[PDB]
Design a protein around this nucleic acid. Sequence first.
RNA 1: AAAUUGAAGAGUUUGAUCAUGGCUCAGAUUGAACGCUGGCGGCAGGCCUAACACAUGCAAGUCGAACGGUAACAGGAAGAAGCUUGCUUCUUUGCUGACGAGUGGCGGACGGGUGAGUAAUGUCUGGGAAACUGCCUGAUGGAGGGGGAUAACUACUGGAAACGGUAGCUAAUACCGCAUAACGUCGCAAGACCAAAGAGGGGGACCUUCGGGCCUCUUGCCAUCGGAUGUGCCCAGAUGGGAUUAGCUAGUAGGUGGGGUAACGGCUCACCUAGGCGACGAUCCCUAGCUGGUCUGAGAGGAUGACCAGCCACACUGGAACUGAGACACGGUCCAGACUCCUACGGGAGGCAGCAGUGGGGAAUAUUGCACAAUGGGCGCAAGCCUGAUGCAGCCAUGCCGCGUG
RNA 2: CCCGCAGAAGAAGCACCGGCUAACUCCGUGCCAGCAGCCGCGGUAAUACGGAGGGUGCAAGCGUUAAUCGGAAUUACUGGGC
Lengths: 82, 86, 151, 205, 80
Amino acid sequence: MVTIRLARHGAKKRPFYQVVVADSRNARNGRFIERVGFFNPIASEKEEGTRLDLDRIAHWVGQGATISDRVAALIKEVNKAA
Amino acid sequence: ANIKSAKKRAIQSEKARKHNASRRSMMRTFIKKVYAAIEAGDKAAAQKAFNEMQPIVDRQAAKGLIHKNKAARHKANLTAQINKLA
Amino acid sequence: AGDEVTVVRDEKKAREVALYRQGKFREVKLARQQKSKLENMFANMTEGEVHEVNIVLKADVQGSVEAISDSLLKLSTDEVKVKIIGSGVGGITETDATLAAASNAILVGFNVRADASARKVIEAESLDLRYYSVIYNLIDEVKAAMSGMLS
Amino acid sequence: ARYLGPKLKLSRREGTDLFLKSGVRAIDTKCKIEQAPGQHGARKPRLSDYGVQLREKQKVRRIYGVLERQFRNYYKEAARLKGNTGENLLALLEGRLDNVVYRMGFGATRAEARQLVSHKAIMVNGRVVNIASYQVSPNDVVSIREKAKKQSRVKAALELAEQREKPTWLEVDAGKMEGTFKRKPERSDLSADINEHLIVELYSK
Amino acid sequence: KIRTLQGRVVSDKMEKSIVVAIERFVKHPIYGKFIKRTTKLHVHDENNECGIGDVVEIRECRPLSKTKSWTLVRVVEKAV
RNA sequence: AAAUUGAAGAGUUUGAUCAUGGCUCAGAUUGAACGCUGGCGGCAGGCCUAACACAUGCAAGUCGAACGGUAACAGGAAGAAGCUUGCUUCUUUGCUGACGAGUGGCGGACGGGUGAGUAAUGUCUGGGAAACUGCCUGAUGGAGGGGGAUAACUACUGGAAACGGUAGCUAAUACCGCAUAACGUCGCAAGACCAAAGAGGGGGACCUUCGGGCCUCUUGCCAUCGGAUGUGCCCAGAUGGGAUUAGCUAGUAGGUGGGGUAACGGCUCACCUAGGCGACGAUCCCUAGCUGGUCUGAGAGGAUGACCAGCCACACUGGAACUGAGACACGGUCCAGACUCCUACGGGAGGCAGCAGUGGGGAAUAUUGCACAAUGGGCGCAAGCCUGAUGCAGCCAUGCCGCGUG
RNA sequence: CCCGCAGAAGAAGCACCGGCUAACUCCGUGCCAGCAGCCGCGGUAAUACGGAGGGUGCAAGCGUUAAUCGGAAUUACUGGGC
Ligand SMILES: [K+]
Ligand SMILES: [K+]
Ligand SMILES: [K+]
Ligand SMILES: [Mg+2]
Ligand SMILES: [Mg+2]
Ligand SMILES: [Mg+2]
Ligand SMILES: [Mg+2]
Ligand SMILES: [Mg+2]
Ligand SMILES: [Mg+2]
Ligand SMILES: [Mg+2]
Ligand SMILES: [Mg+2]
Ligand SMILES: [Mg+2]
Ligand SMILES: [Mg+2]
Ligand SMILES: [Mg+2]
Ligand SMILES: [Mg+2]
Ligand SMILES: [Mg+2]
Ligand SMILES: [Mg+2]
Ligand SMILES: [Mg+2]
Ligand SMILES: [Mg+2]
Ligand SMILES: [Mg+2]
Ligand SMILES: [Mg+2]
Ligand SMILES: [Mg+2]
Ligand SMILES: [Mg+2]
Ligand SMILES: [Mg+2]
Ligand SMILES: [Mg+2]
Ligand SMILES: [Mg+2]
Ligand SMILES: [Mg+2]
Ligand SMILES: [Mg+2]
Ligand SMILES: [Mg+2]
Ligand SMILES: [Mg+2]
Ligand SMILES: [Mg+2]
Ligand SMILES: [Mg+2]
Ligand SMILES: [Mg+2]
Ligand SMILES: [Mg+2]
Ligand SMILES: [Mg+2]
Ligand SMILES: [Mg+2]
Ligand SMILES: [Mg+2]
Ligand SMILES: [Mg+2]
Ligand SMILES: [Mg+2]
Ligand SMILES: [Mg+2]
Ligand SMILES: [Mg+2]
Ligand SMILES: [Mg+2]
Ligand SMILES: [Mg+2]
Ligand SMILES: [Mg+2]
Ligand SMILES: [Mg+2]
Ligand SMILES: [Mg+2]
């Protein structure tokens, strides 16, 4: 199936997760259909902590995709913020 | 092999194999009989063979042993031949 | 063989200690060899009747190498000399194969075997591999080998 | 690494003062500047074009206390930027923290300023920065810690910097022992003794 | 709407099949001199209506036969 | 606004000169090696050679909410027995929690490794029609009633072992009928035909043998049309050297009819035609995994494919097929070969180019480490289990980069 | 990542110096021993061999070798000739 999962980027002790729509059968950093946004658990308070394109999330879920736990909590938090 | 699952899988695959062998054997027996009737030229016998064969392919395709398209092709070609006869 | 074994505290210093020990040993051994060679080259200008036999030796354990080499070197005579080119512990490998093939020598395996890499060079080369498992028979055959050269 | 050796020998080779001393005594009272170092320093040989370009480059590099690779990186960055490369690289070199803090008058020599910096004695914008090669931005504020505010060498520095010429793009308050770097200079505010063309043609081979 | 290519007959010997040359005219990569290249294709035709020397129109189709993946559409001009 | 601003020569043939012409040097860069020397830190990188051979440890499991069940540990129950009368051995009970082995379900076709082979069976780009697809999702409905086996187990019984053979032996979402059948299949129509499986949670009243019935909820199963995803098939162009390699081809090129495949097709056979490709380079020989890119260069260009990412192929060598939604399958099966090992010589076992590691080759390249805390993956309702992927650590001036030795 | 302690205290080598090409003098040998990328040094006046003093360039690195491009318009389409 297609799902939205977190892909790790950046450097040691410096994580940067892309939010990715991809087949579950590929690797963590493997092929994917579309990049949707990003999250950074290290960034300082003067910089944006996260960004997601909610419309595409809705579109793909309607198509039939599934959401992981961390991504789901992320959408929950952003919806709380806005 | 080395892993438990490999051994168990081989053991059950053997069973699946002999069962499939038997069912496919019945399948070919029936198509052979209907083909022989078709070459014979007796329309009544051909129709009778077609009607005894017809449920069998559908049942075996239902269980997945042969995909639906193969059964459909067989039935359509055989009825085309029987109409060639008459 | 026989060297003292000690546990050491730290990691980095051991490598330097071992390499420093190796450098001086290499220096000294080369020093003796080239001292002898430089001193005696022109003394070797004269010649005489000498029967030399060259052997290359592979043995299973360190002490076995020592013993076999010691026996062969003590067996040397003023006119009959058994000059071992070089010996080491382990299997008969391509270094030994091409070494014995290069010089007029023989590969002797004492409780050790050959390997495919040396095997190919040997079959192409027609080098002689002599196999023995008892010290006595080895001494007997090598004694025959050197004694056959005379006259 | 740095150049830790004798200092006046650099000036003698280059043939002109490099301000590598405090200034309590005139440079001539310390060394025979006109003669080059070495036993054959009396002679004046011919210097070819490549020689003079190399001497100019070496003069700049020694005056700002920069090693070779760092200077190469500076030149590359200046080439990448817009405008006349000489102007840009001159701005780049003057953008170092050591040159600025010396130029603000908090030290006797660039070496002394660097030794102060490396020992966490300064803040920019209230943030302690010990890295010498840090590059400063306009409107940044530089100050000394109160902990090292008591240093007598800093005190005497505040005085001996007075007899020097003071810059135009900088503002300094001895009352609060701090400074503001209003804006970056162009080529004009610096010495005409620096010929940038030779450096440009040298590296651009 | 259908993509269609136009070409020259060169072989009507094959049964219910013809051979057509498509001439294309393109520049050279580095030299820039304009060359004239040709592609030969096998086309299916069902009444053998074509003749050598004609110029016809053909289009893509399923693999009706091995090495026969294009179909005749309309005969543009006749030989002779 | 922005996203480019780019171009140096010198030495050397002669008594001396101009020219032509070869040679040598100054610059960048590397998966580098060796010599001398050696403080710290941050990020990266580390068998290019024998696709040579491998000791040892680990690298693929999970579900008692599918099932017959107690192999172990625990709790309860009779009170066995004891017994200090309210404390402790064995006396048991699938009774409960759980769970060794077994059937059954899903997963080992992904993740990882390597570049031996291939001049196209590949790849890159742009188009296309005759196709299927588990887990995910939309809709419409369906879910009645039976039958005979088997593992486990029990009692025997061969072999050195691997591994067996016989008899009794029980259940299920295992297996197989029958009913029912349209929007599905075939058919011009008329007509003809096709499916299945339950489990768990809680409960008032009523039945009630308390076996549970009965109500409700969740989750499973069957059919058909859709979506999303993956994969299969075809076309045009592009993709090394050698013309001291000029002709190649008979299922070969077409056509008719059968057969086969999920699908079109000489994919396969019978017959008929005598064709097809080639100087716009066929056939043949040598070499080679490709690409997004990397280095160099003012540019056009030249060389190259280490690391990251997409595609292809391979798993001791050669050949074949089953199971399966999907393989002609690294840690699956069968046959042949070589090689290594065990033996009662009667016969057997093996496959690191997975992570460490050893031998060997070489100028040359590391630890037989910690943890599933995070990302991601398989199984489950979930708790949870597994993961040498991955996170982190150890060695190495291999490189870029910052600092000090006042 | 921060604070305290003591002490200049625990820490600099490599290559080159005749022209190309930045930087010279003496001693030791005497076409020998040797150097070398090229022209070429050495037969008792060696800035070119060895040692020393001085100097030049890099720097926790410095050199030699291997290899690709540039210099090469020396395959010349941009850009060569008979
Ligand atoms: K087996
Ligand atoms: K049933
Ligand atoms: K020091
Ligand atoms: Mg992959
Ligand atoms: Mg099944
Ligand atoms: Mg550095
Ligand atoms: Mg065009
Ligand atoms: Mg620190
Ligand atoms: Mg149970
Ligand atoms: Mg019990
Ligand atoms: Mg269990
Ligand atoms: Mg497998
Ligand atoms: Mg390899
Ligand atoms: Mg396409
Ligand atoms: Mg039975
Ligand atoms: Mg029963
Ligand atoms: Mg079933
Ligand atoms: Mg009807
Ligand atoms: Mg039925
Ligand atoms: Mg290529
Ligand atoms: Mg034929
Ligand atoms: Mg046909
Ligand atoms: Mg290859
Ligand atoms: Mg550039
Ligand atoms: Mg290019
Ligand atoms: Mg590769
Ligand atoms: Mg192998
Ligand atoms: Mg095979
Ligand atoms: Mg199958
Ligand atoms: Mg395969
Ligand atoms: Mg394996
Ligand atoms: Mg075997
Ligand atoms: Mg390995
Ligand atoms: Mg070696
Ligand atoms: Mg997880
Ligand atoms: Mg495990
Ligand atoms: Mg380091
Ligand atoms: Mg000079
Ligand atoms: Mg020298
Ligand atoms: Mg001359
Ligand atoms: Mg002299
Ligand atoms: Mg000298
Ligand atoms: Mg000196
Ligand atoms: Mg050029
Ligand atoms: Mg060129
Ligand atoms: Mg010319």
